[PDB]
Nucleic acid binder design. Structure first.
Ligand SMILES: [Mg+2]
Ligand SMILES: [Mg+2]
Ligand SMILES: [Mg+2]
Ligand SMILES: [Mg+2]
Ligand SMILES: [Mg+2]
Ligand SMILES: [Mg+2]
Ligand SMILES: [Mg+2]
Ligand SMILES: [Mg+2]
Ligand SMILES: [Mg+2]
Ligand SMILES: [Mg+2]
Ligand SMILES: [Mg+2]
Ligand SMILES: [Mg+2]
Ligand SMILES: [Mg+2]
Ligand SMILES: [Mg+2]
Ligand SMILES: [Mg+2]
Ligand SMILES: [Mg+2]
Ligand SMILES: [Mg+2]
Ligand SMILES: [Mg+2]
Ligand SMILES: [Mg+2]
Ligand SMILES: [Mg+2]
Ligand SMILES: [Mg+2]
Ligand SMILES: [Mg+2]
Ligand SMILES: [Mg+2]
Ligand SMILES: [Zn+2]
Lengths: 116, 59, 182, 82
RNA sequence: ACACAUGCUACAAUGGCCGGUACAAAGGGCUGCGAUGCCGUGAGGUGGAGCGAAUCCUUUCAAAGCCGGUCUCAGUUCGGAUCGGGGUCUGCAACUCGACCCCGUGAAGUCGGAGUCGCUAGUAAUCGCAGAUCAGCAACGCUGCGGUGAAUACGUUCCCG
RNA sequence: UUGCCUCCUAAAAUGUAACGGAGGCGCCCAAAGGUUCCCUCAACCUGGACGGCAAUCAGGUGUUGAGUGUAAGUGCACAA
């Protein structure tokens, strides 16, 4: 189907299908589908246009998802990067921000291994 | 209008969840398009601080 | 004994709107819109001749008339390109079809853009013609999501009789085009 | 994070110093060794010399910096690379 | 910017997730262990029954197990790193530097080259539990406790001592 | 080095030497030939999803600076 700018996968149970939306994950799925009253055990084939309407209305109502969410998170990172906060210096360097161990690991921040 | 080379241009009717109807030309051979969002629906057409975040917590 | 809706809305309202706003000496100097050109530059058609055949079906489905392939008129090294390799496709829209496409685009396609914050008013060039790009052909409804190989972008340009950017902006504004304000 | 039940932490030392500073309307450079006090709206325009352990660093508090501990804006260790 | 070493979690279907249900051993407790109840979604909050403890609390204590449903081989309902927001508790104080919870985020990774290590039965493999240090914890460590439980040993030519 | 083609030398017809100065050729094309009909570049400016000095799209300025299978000259926008 089509929901909030996304394209829902061909066959998935709806609680898994809604997770392709960038602002939603399994728990928010078991919230949204409980509130709307749409069974989570349905396919994406058996979804209707009306059901898509109730869904879009609800999750645009109480939840921020997708593009606005990304813009907002990016906005938080550049917010703390500008004020010259410690975490900001870390984001600049491309190192681990949470106080983790940079002597050995941290490759997921640094990226692939570049030898000397 | 060279005769054969073009895709067929049908008459078409566009229907929306907000009730708006449109009568247009389209390439859809059915001749009917049901669509979710339009010029009337969309929140852009219709127009839809750290210290505050501090005083909300503590105040 | 027939009529497209936007041609109608133009002839009856917008015309008088602009005539009240800009106070033209003659009724002729009223800007109308000449043509709408749609263009898909491929560029990887230098490497693969198959992609052009995808571009063709795209435009031909979206517009409703068969595209016109363009040769490369120069030969360039860095882009791996010679003269006579088909590079990109172009469709010119005039009269009725122009109007109907403009309407489907204004009323349907553009509201279906992912994170649509509107269009920049700044895209006019000096003469009051308006060009804007698009990232993915998935927005249009005559094109099926199911059948796409790969998202491909296209340029839409609306070229007008407008003399400057003010007049053109006013014309498209009146026409239902979603401009941001700055 | 410190729990909300306790409220935000500012040591009484620079609490008193910044109060005396903004009641006389003078904005001075206050010399503080406390890394551990969170920033309050009372501090919003002032300027601090904070201890990084080797020296005192100039810190101009702005609006964006509220809700943060002081030490974050004076970095400790120096790394210029290899 | 790196290289080494020991570990843990993985790369999935002998599996993941939801629901129901059965079985341990050992331990720990005074300004300590803290129950029913109530408030939370959950870390926990309020509260203090009862215990210097074969009695009370750690729930009657487990998890893998068994029954059932769903997922259908995919970078996925696999994987959890990373990062954003929002919290709780300890503590004069969680910035440099704590743990935990909640929402989102969802990277490498498709059984790993040359090489190399451990193990001969309640052993390997796998599953949780407790303890010491300790206000809190970098515990995936260490010392113990039990659960379920294999394969193979022709034989001394070869490598090691 | 030796034949053929173009410029300069060459002294405003033609012609004109040197072991004077520069280059080319010993082919290509079944269309790059014949004809009818249509069109105008290069460069520069503004604007456009990848896309950048430069790909394709739009608009503007631009009388010839592009382009002519292949050297160079004489020509060709009236178009060769
Ligand atoms: Mg114009
Ligand atoms: Mg070593
Ligand atoms: Mg370890
Ligand atoms: Mg395990
Ligand atoms: Mg697991
Ligand atoms: Mg999982
Ligand atoms: Mg269970
Ligand atoms: Mg025993
Ligand atoms: Mg409860
Ligand atoms: Mg029970
Ligand atoms: Mg996953
Ligand atoms: Mg990979
Ligand atoms: Mg696999
Ligand atoms: Mg191997
Ligand atoms: Mg032995
Ligand atoms: Mg401890
Ligand atoms: Mg002569
Ligand atoms: Mg002569
Ligand atoms: Mg003479
Ligand atoms: Mg002579
Ligand atoms: Mg020669
Ligand atoms: Mg010919
Ligand atoms: Mg042009
Ligand atoms: Zn609508």
């Amino acid at each position: 189907a089509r929901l909030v700018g996304v394209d829902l996968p061909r066959d998935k149970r709806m609680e898994i299908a809604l997770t392709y939306i960038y602002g939603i994950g399994r728990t928010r799925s078991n919230e949204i589908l409980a509130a709307t009253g749409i069974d989570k055990n349905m396919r994406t084939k058996d979804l209707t246009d009306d059901q898509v309407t109730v869904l879009r209305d609800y999750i645009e109502g109480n939840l921020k998802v997708e593009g606005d969410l990304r813009r907002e998170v990016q906005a938080d990172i550049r917010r703390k990067i500008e004020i010259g906060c410690y975490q900001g210096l870390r984001h600049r360097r491309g190192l681990p921000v949470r106080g983790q161990r940079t002597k050995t690991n941290a490759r997921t921040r640094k990226g692939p291994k570049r030898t000397i | 209008m060279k005769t054969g080379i073009h895709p067929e241009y049908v008459d078409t009717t566009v229907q929306c969840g907000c009730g708006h109807s449109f009568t247009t030309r389209s390439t859809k051979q059915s001749g009917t398009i049901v669509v979710e969002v339009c010029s009337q629906c969309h929140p852009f057409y219709t127009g839809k601080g750290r210290v505050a975040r501090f005083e909300k917590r503590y105040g | 004994k027939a009529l497209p809706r936007l041609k109608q809305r133009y002839r009856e309202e917008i015309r008088e709107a602009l005539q009240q706003e800009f106070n033209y000496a003659n009724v002729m100097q009223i800007p109308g819109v000449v043509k709408v050109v749609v263009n898909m530059g491929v560029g990887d058609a230098a490497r693969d001749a198959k992609l052009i055949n995808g571009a063709i079906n795209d435009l031909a489905l979206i517009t409703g008339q068969k595209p016109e392939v363009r040769r490369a008129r120069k030969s360039i090294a860095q882009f791996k390109l010679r003269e006579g390799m088909p590079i990109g496709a172009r469709v010119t829209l005039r009269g009725d079809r122009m109007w109907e496409f403009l309407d489907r685009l204004i009323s349907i396609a553009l509201p279906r853009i992912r994170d649509f914050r509107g269009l920049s008013p700044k895209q006019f060039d000096g003469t009051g013609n308006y060009t804007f790009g698009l990232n993915e052909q998935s927005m249009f409804h005559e094109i099926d999501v199911d059948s796409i190989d790969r998202p491909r972008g296209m340029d839409i340009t609306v070229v007008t009789t407008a003399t400057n950017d003010a007049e053109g902006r006013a014309l498209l504004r009146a026409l239902g085009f979603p401009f941001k304000e700055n | 994070p410190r729990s909300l039940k306790k409220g935000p932490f500012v040591d009484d030392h620079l609490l008193k110093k910044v109060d005396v500073q903004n009641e006389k309307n003078t904005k001075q450079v206050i010399k503080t060794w406390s890394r551990r006090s969170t920033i309050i709206p009372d501090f919003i325009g002032h300027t601090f010399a904070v201890h990084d352990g080797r020296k005192h660093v100039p810190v101009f508090v702005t609006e964006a910096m509220v809700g943060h501990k002081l030490g974050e804006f004076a970095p400790t260790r120096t790394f210029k690379g290899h």
